[PDB]
Design a protein around this ligand. Structure first.
Ligand SMILES: *[C@@H]1O[C@H](CO)[C@@H](O[C@@H]2O[C@H](CO)[C@@H](O[C@@H]3O[C@H](CO)[C@@H](O)[C@H](O)[C@@H]3O)[C@H](O)[C@H]2NC(C)=O)[C@H](O)[C@H]1NC(C)=O
Length: 164
């Protein structure tokens, strides 16, 4: 009876140039459920029109987020966003958002409380502040946006469980 939905979207840059498209891994109760990219979604009369629309839009957002990182244009870099929601046995919820730069976690938000966790190193702190500025100023994200992110995730989790 405890359930979880986990989205993992990755975008890449080469010599500072952000690559076309994206790659999303979705997990339902810990089991790999979908691989999605620019072209289509495929599981692991099959139609994924909701996921293709929503994940493409997120892909677009994260690509602009990576472009706004004032780091370096030498080699491969990756920005990776994880979105998680859980329904616990006692009907309570957890939900969070996590950013990874070149495999290292550097920023998290708890979507139940809207509090952010900043990293230890100054290098990671620079990345966190860059991203948080982009989200607040350029993307114009507000409390309602993050409340809505929680709700959307939970509603999707409930939708998938309702079918199978
Ligand atoms: C989010 O999903 C991505 C994939 O879409 C996960 O990355 C993939 O998983 C592992 C670990 O990062 C990689 O495989 C392992 O590392 C090397 C690659 O250098 C590989 O040669 C080994 O065979 C080993 O199994 C895999 O290559 C990697 N794929 C990509 C495209 O990066 C990632 O772990 C997920 N992140 C989170 C935070 O859940």
């Amino acid at each position: 009876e405890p359930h979880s939905l986990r989205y993992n979207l990755t975008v890449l840059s080469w010599d500072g140039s952000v690559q076309s498209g994206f790659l999303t891994e979705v997990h339902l109760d810990g089991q790999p459920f979908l691989r999605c990219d620019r072209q289509k979604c495929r599981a692991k009369n099959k139609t994924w029109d909701r996921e293709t629309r929503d994940l493409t839009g997120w892909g677009k957002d994260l690509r602009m987020t990576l472009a706004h990182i004032k780091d370096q244009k030498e080699g491969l870099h990756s920005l990776q966003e994880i979105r998680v929601c859980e329904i616990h046995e006692d009907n309570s919820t957890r939900s969070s958002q996590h950013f990874y730069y070149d495999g290292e976690l550097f920023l998290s938000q708890n979507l139940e409380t809207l509090e952010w966790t900043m990293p230890q190193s100054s290098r990671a702190q620079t990345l966190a502040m860059n991203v948080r500025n982009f989200l607040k100023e350029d993307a114009m994200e507000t409390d309602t946006h993050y409340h809505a992110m929680r709700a959307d995730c939970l509603s999707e989790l409930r939708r998938y469980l309702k079918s199978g």
